Design a protein around this ligand. Structure first.
Ligand SMILES: [K+]
Ligand SMILES: [K+]
Ligand SMILES: [K+]
Ligand SMILES: [K+]
Ligand SMILES: [K+]
Lengths: 93, 93, 93, 93
């Protein structure tokens, strides 16, 4: 419980940072910077944008190595400690 | 057995939702909306399309966090509890 | 040992199938069809091509669910049962 | 500790190799070759570039199978043995 809360806050902050950077350095709209941050950390990849500035490319490299771990951690616990029980409870005859 | 069935149905529903949304909000053909939903949740990424509407971008963000977990769960059990035995049985001298 | 060999052959066959399909249905060169098959199953994603035919889009969907599992299995054992020992042996004072 | 150091050096070398290849064979700038190497091994995918030469496509295929394992290994230990403790220490009442 408190674990998922911590991972949630950590993820929120990680995304906020991405939103602020890509909207300031790469000139994206707040919503687009968020989207790029999300698809990047989850490794989906954005097909409509790639960092154009060397500053953006360097940041993304570091942003990736530092973000993917905690992002998938959240996704992990989000599924295991939240998504799993809900479906099991719905099954119970 | 019953586990893979549950994960299969859950995945089917998850994809159906994606197909309906992207074909209604993003104006994709049913088959293309399905494809985008699949390549997104499996993190492959679609190189020929990205949500153009802010509504589409927001949904995708949430769709990703909620879908990736169960999708890879299915892929996991699909491989372990289905793909693995089949190949082992084929090996048996 | 024999495990990595099995996973290797399985992966080879999986890629061969992809190479033959994408070069026949999507009209790609043999090398490009292979590349697309590789970047898709490893979830990297191809930024220069997406299936144009409905036949190609349907196949890719199934190809993804069936391929990712064994591909990452190979990558897993390739790293653990092959890449890991080699680096450890190189460390030994 | 010494484990993360080994995985770090291994990753650095893996990326250096990618940077040198893509800047020599694919004619990318050093920073862009590095970026492509990073987004590829982490499976994010690059939406602004794909190998144009058959030499580049073949190398990438092998580069992927050999790199993803150690890259995610680093990301794994980077998160578990470095990122995890730091956040836990920050929590302690
Ligand atoms: K990707
Ligand atoms: K892509
Ligand atoms: K991926
Ligand atoms: K991608
Ligand atoms: K493109």
């Amino acid at each position: 419980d408190k674990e998922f809360q911590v991972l949630f806050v950590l993820t929120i902050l990680t995304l906020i940072s991405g939103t602020i950077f890509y909207s300031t350095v790469e000139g994206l709209r707040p919503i687009d910077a968020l989207y790029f941050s999300v698809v990047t950390l989850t490794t989906v990849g954005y097909g409509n944008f790639s960092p154009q500035t060397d500053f953006g490319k360097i940041f993304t490299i570091l942003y990736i190595f530092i973000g993917i771990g905690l992002v998938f951690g959240f996704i992990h616990k989000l599924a295991v400690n939240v998504q799993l029980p809900s479906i099991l409870s719905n099954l119970v005859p």
